[PDB]
């Protein structure tokens, strides 16, 4: 019964997980039981999503966030994002949920039964937070494992089925990506892409070649960064640049996760390659360009002269120019002219949209996909009424893209706050004034006046 | 739908994802049994 | 007096709340005011 009141730890009940900072066996069971919770939710939600699953309806019309992730991997989906076998979804639900009891056993074991600290039973597993080479050894072990995980995705993409390609010919199909981009000027040229419009930093990855080869590059620098951090100790420039505390590494991870949640929010909102609109629905960009296309289609079918047709303002109602000069979709969707989907690349020639490819060359699957993507925009309410805020309660639709971007913005902002909390605290803790100011040695009364 | 040998246990699955929300609330039951000491 | 542990009261009165607000949130989707 150490670190379990505020008499022994100096941490209250609402910061009672901070009583486990120097309890390596108990902090391990904290993390394995929590790992069991993520793998439980991965399991139980996938089962909940597949028990309440209609394979007639598209995935975005069903409030599904996890079945689209298994479907993106190339499991149980065929031509155009259509489910032909729900058993690869069910196995992912069962292998996760059953594995959660093993991590639930081992989380409960190390937390409430095992040795409270690992520093006695196993010097290999026993760690001090301020032991810098051990803290890279666990970092090197976890880097190789994420290098193993980023090579499993390459394995599923290159050997074990291929991933779903939105840019497959003739519509979307699961495609074995056999020639991935190994070129580092393309892989790391994504890193030097601007985040802003038309460039879209790494969210603009628009083919499964750079995805697989980028995960060969990430998957092997994480292995080679694991072998780096296993075989080395931190260098002297880094020892003076970091707080070496348990809460410090937490804050560095929290700040890293705030980056990742803000990026994955942007991936699910803008990218329709690694988040195919077959499964996740049209993007915000995708639905506004689909609306301009549907009425480009409808009115030219009534014989409108859509290139010369004017808006109220002088601009093209259907076809105006981007500020770089490309023929783009008229209307307010001029903000979304940097959008690339596969239902309108047969329109895009080298000047932007080709007017002669609009007149006698728009296929009925494109009219179908644009009308579907317009009426399934990622606009919706919190009670899941589809449409605008002024829409009536008939359409039970919020996109998974809206659910995924907003949840991973709520989480990613708080993880920035949690980084600011824990980075401020862990540097206040390593300097010795997180509990307050000493009255006998208050720094400001020893600090000179201002004016 | 689930595979048809699994629909007996389908009301179980319908409340299976509420379980991780209740682990958070069980830490408050466990903290209240010890009186938040 | 202190016969019943107060946490058992605090864990079932707090479970009376989520049953009722869970009943209130279910009736958002059922019957009147459900837009159906």
């Amino acid at each position: 019964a150490t670190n379990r009141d505020q008499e022994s730890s100096g941490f209250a009940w609402w910061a009672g997980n901070a009583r486990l900072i120097n309890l390596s066996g108990k902090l391990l069971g904290a993390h394995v039981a929590h790992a069991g919770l993520i793998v439980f939710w991965a399991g139980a939600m996938t089962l909940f999503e597949l028990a309440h699953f209609i394979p007639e309806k598209p995935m975005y019309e069903q409030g599904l966030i996890l079945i689209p992730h298994i479907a993106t991997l190339g499991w149980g989906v065929g031509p155009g994002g259509e489910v032909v076998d729900t058993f690869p979804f069910f196995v992912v639900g069962v292998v996760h949920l059953i594995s959660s009891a093993v991590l639930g056993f081992g989380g409960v074991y190390h937390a409430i039964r095992g040795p409270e600290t690992l520093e006695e039973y196993s010097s290999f597993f026993g760690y001090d937070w301020k032991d810098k080479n051990k803290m890279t050894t666990i970092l090197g072990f976890h880097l190789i494992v994420l290098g193993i995980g980023a090579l499993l995705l390459v394995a599923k993409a290159m050997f074990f089925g291929g991933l779903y390609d939105t840019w497959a010919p003739g519509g979307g199909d699961v495609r074995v990506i056999t020639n991935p981009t190994l070129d580092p000027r393309v892989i790391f040229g994504y890193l030097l892409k601007s985040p802003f419009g038309g460039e879209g930093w790494i969210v603009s990855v628009n083919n499964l070649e750079d995805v697989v080869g980028g995960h060969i590059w990430i998957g092997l620098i994480c292995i080679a960064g694991g072998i780096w951090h296993i075989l080395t100790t931190p260098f002297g420039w880094a020892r003076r640049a970091f707080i070496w505390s348990g809460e410090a590494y937490l804050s560095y991870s929290l700040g890293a996760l705030s980056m990742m949640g803000f990026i994955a929010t942007c991936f699910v909102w803008f990218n329709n390659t690694v988040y195919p609109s077959e499964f996740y629905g049209p993007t915000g960009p995708e639905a506004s360009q689909a609306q301009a296309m549907t009425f480009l289609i409808r009115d030219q079918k009534l014989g409108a002269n859509v290139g010369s047709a004017q808006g109220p303002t002088g601009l093209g109602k259907y076809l105006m120019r981007s500020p770089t000069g490309e023929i783009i979709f008229g209307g307010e969707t001029m903000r979304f002219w940097d959008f690339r989907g596969p239902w309108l690349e047969p329109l895009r020639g080298p000047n932007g949209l080709d007017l002669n490819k609009i007149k006698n060359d728009i296929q009925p699957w494109q009219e179908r996909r644009a009308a579907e993507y317009m009426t399934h925009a990622p606009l919706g309410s919190l009670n899941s009424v589809g449409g605008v805020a002024t829409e009536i309660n008939s359409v039970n639709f919020v996109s998974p893209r809206s659910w995924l971007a907003t949840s991973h913005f709520v989480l990613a902002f708080f993880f920035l706050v949690g980084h600011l909390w824990h980075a401020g605290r862990a540097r206040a803790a390593a300097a010795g004034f997180e509990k307050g100011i000493d009255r006998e040695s208050e720094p400001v009364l020893s600090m000179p006046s201002l004016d | 739908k689930l595979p048809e040998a699994y629909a007996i246990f389908d009301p179980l699955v319908d409340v299976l994802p509420v379980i991780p929300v209740l682990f958070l609330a069980l830490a408050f039951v466990w903290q209240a049994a010890v009186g938040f000491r | 007096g202190g016969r019943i542990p107060l946490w058992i009261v605090a864990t079932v009165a707090g479970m009376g709340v989520i049953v009722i607000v869970g009943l209130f949130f279910y009736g958002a989707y059922a019957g009147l005011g459900s837009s159906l």
């Binding site: - | 319908d14 509420v18 069980l26 039951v29 | -």
Partner: peptide, 27 residues
């Protein structure tokens, strides 16, 4: 029913905590 699942799923959380209280276990 879905509720009698979620009742016994929900009740048997604090019954872990009920047993370790009425057995004076390591609560």
């Amino acid at each position: 029913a879905q509720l009698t699942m979620i009742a016994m799923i929900g009740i048997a959380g604090p019954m872990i905590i009920f047993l370790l209280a009425v057995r004076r276990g390591n609560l």
